[PDB]
């Protein structure tokens, strides 16, 4: 735009554009590196470093797992009747009770996290002729031998184990989740001493499903000086159905229902500390601002979150093309 030397009969009017100095390089479909005046970042590169709980009821799992809090671990007794929107499980979590192994651990954890509540109602179950509240040395609660708080270990009484046959109908207007299990002893002598029968059998059935399990007596590697395991099963009773628990031994009896529901709850595995914010999105690294369309922090998300992409940066051309000099 070299303007002439101002002749006083005829002169020029020029047109131009913005061209801020030293703009930003973006990507187009012709040029992979073109400079524009302004550009915005569309990928959330980093988080604030911590989870924080203003919109969502974040429940810190601490050194407790969701299944342990479901079962009633003495170190997880502080989670009784607790609701949440996101259970943050920590990598430091462990178990300090009787060893257990859920055969469908992922499914049980997913359904309990989707229900998103630990509210528990006790039922007056009709256990007749057996001994309730069995205790173990590997499960310590206030310096005494204890067990899971939501599970009832039923043993022999006076060297006799009558064949259990109980019934609790769902007369309410909601689903009833019954958590139970089968005890796997270590020896035939131990099985005889515990349940007075050489072999047990549990048939927890409803009006649309049945679950028959057999205890597997045998030796196992010792966890907390216990060579036995308890595999945990669950049963869901719809309104109008009837929970029929009949057994002849090796029953870890339930104590009530857990009131599963449908909502917006989930579970996350994270190690970030919990602070104070107002943030809609939670990643295992921490809460991110959900103002950018995309992210590269983590593929695990909860809430209104940007979509995960593999790109590190994506500059949208906010301004015009920069032509300096």
């Amino acid at each position: 735009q070299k303007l002439p030397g101002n002749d006083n009969s005829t002169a020029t009017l020029c047109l131009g554009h913005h061209a801020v100095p030293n703009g930003t390089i973006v990507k187009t479909i012709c040029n992979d590196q073109i400079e524009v005046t302004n550009a915005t970042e569309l990928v959330q590169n980093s988080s604030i470093g911590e989870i924080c709980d203003s919109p969502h009821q974040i429940l810190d799992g601490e050194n407790c797992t969701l299944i342990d809090a479901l079962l009633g671990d003495p170190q997880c007794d502080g989670f009784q009747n607790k609701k949440w929107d996101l259970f943050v499980e920590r990598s430091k979590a462990y178990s300090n009770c009787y060893p257990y192994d859920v055969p469908d651990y992922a499914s049980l954890r997913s359904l309990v996290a989707s229900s998103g509540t630990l509210e528990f109602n006790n039922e007056s179950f009709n256990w007749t002729g057996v001994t309730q509240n069995g205790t173990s040395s590997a499960c310590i609660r206030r310096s005494n031998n204890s067990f899971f708080s939501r599970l009832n270990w039923l043993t022999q009484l006076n060297f006799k184990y009558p064949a259990l046959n109980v019934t609790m109908p769902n007369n309410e207007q909601f689903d009833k989740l019954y958590i139970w299990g089968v005890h796997h002893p270590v020896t035939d002598k131990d099985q005889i001493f515990l349940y007075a029968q050489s072999s047990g059998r549990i048939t927890v059935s409803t009006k649309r499903s049945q679950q028959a399990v057999i205890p597997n007596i045998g030796y196992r590697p010792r966890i907390r000086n216990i060579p036995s395991r308890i595999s945990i099963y669950w049963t869901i009773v719809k309104p109008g159905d009837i929970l029929l628990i009949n057994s002849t031994g090796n029953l870890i009896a339930p104590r009530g229902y857990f009131k599963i529901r449908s909502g917006k709850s989930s579970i996350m595995r994270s190690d970030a500390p919990i602070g104070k914010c107002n943030s809609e999105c939670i990643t295992p690294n921490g809460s991110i601002p959900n103002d950018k369309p995309f992210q590269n922090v983590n593929r695990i998300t909860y809430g209104a979150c940007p979509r995960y992409v593999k790109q590190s940066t994506l500059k949208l051309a906010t301004g015009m093309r920069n032509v300096p000099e």
């Binding site: 735009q1 002169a11 020029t12 047109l15 913005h18 524009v36 709850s265 595995r269 093309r321």
Partner: protein, 173 residues
């Protein structure tokens, strides 16, 4: 950049345009002067902020999903979940890359279109009272190009009382 204005006949941009995006600049008898064009600048900002309201915000809520990190080996279900998550991530990464590239190309083409639109609007306002020199400037031939009869290049240029074609528009040396 298909209209060929920002990188075309305009050889370079103008550092110092701190108020607008497109503007006018002159040197007449009453000295040099600059002004910004509010209409084209506002139209460009309007379309770019429309893209910004489409992109910024509007995040879908995904509360409960599948597990995406596994600490053990299971087999079929693990492979299927990993395959589904990798497929979703690859498809969304391709969508993000294509959207960014297409919208950047559209933004540059829109800027070129707005610059060419302002240039052609000024050319149609001037009619035969000015000649385009190919630098994006308009050699205006009568008098007082942008001081007293040239603040009216907001839409009110008379182009009839200054039909001065005899001075230098059609003249012999």
């Amino acid at each position: 950049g298909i209209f060929g204005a920002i990188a075309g006949f305009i050889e370079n941009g103008w550092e110092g345009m701190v108020d607008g995006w497109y503007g006018f600049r002159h040197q007449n008898s009453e000295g040099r002067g600059q002004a910004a064009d509010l209409k084209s600048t506002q139209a460009a900002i309007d379309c770019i902020n429309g893209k910004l309201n489409r992109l910024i915000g509007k995040t879908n809520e995904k509360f409960h999903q599948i597990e995406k990190e596994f600490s053990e080996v299971e087999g079929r279900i693990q492979d299927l979940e990993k395959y589904v998550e990798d497929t979703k991530i690859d498809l969304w990464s391709y969508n993000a890359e294509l959207l960014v590239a297409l919208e950047n190309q559209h933004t540059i083409d829109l800027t070129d279109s707005e610059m060419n639109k302002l240039f052609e609007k000024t050319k149609k306002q001037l009619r035969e009272n000015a000649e385009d020199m190919g630098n994006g400037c308009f050699k205006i031939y009568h008098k007082c190009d942008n001081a007293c009869i040239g603040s009216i290049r907001n839409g009110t240029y008379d182009h009839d009382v200054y039909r001065d074609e005899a001075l230098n528009n059609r003249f012999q040396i």
